[model samples]
Target: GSSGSSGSNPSSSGGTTKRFRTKFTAEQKEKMLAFAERLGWRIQKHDDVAVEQFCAETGVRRQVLKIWMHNNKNSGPSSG
Candidate 1:
């Protein structure tokens, strides 16, 4: 059985998938920005070690980080 943190998927019977919205704390966002800047705001094979370290240290998902970067690529921090 799924636990509380196990996210749900959509169903065909008019059911909806539970979307996970990341509520970034101030510290988390600051750290993310610092790491992103260190990597030149880009994720690449060469950044794997740092990326994993960041994820482990910040408890942020890889997909979330990717999406955050993608969404904020051209925008200001407050815009996100």
Candidate 2:
């Protein structure tokens, strides 16, 4: 019955799962910085409404913006 049921339903994966993290490429990084510059906002800083507006206009997620800021801060020589 279980095998028959699985065959009947194509969406079942037997509990298998996959996850991934996306990163910005160098070109994307440059684009993001340009967007921030146009908005007069810091590339790596969080600004709630500003970020939301940017996401809405550019179709980029807020998480990517957060990660960009985090990565910039971490990689900055003065951050240490």
Candidate 3:
């Protein structure tokens, strides 16, 4: 009986995990690239307002923006 009830234990539970993912559109990418270039492709402490505004406008999370900036800084090439 104890063995049969072991699998039915109610004390065990798995909590739900929240995931965040953003799909960047071409327009959003262009805007982000332009803004980053304007800021010298860096995120400064004084850039709080700009960061918030762009993220809000582009529907991208701050994390995603930061990551994109880092990645672009490493290997981004000019079209010219």
Supply the global lDDT for candidate 2.
0.58
Of the candidates numbered 1 and 3, which has the greater lDDT value? 3
Can you write out model 3's per-residue Cα lDDT over 1-80, one digit (the tens) per residue?
45554465333233445965445677679998898897777878888789899877876556777777887796856686
- TM for every model, in the order presented, reads 0.63, 0.42, 0.61
Clashes of each: 0, 1, 0
Estimate the TM-score for candidate 1: 0.63
Q: How accurate is candidate 3 locally (lDDT)?
A: 0.74
Model 1, range 1-80, lDDT digits (tens) per residue? 66567667642223337975567666668988887777777888998878888888876667778777776677745543
Q: Candidate 1 vs candidate 2: which has greater TM-score?
A: 1
The best candidate by lDDT is 3
Backbone clash total, candidate 1: 0
Residue-level lDDT of model 2, residues 1-80, one tens digit each, is 45554345333123425955554455556766776565543543456777777667654677766666565554646644
Q: Model 3, stretches more than 4 Å misplaced? A: 1-22, 75-80
> Which 10 consecutive positions of candidate 3 have the poorest summed lDDT?
8-17
TM-score pick, better of 1 and 3: 1
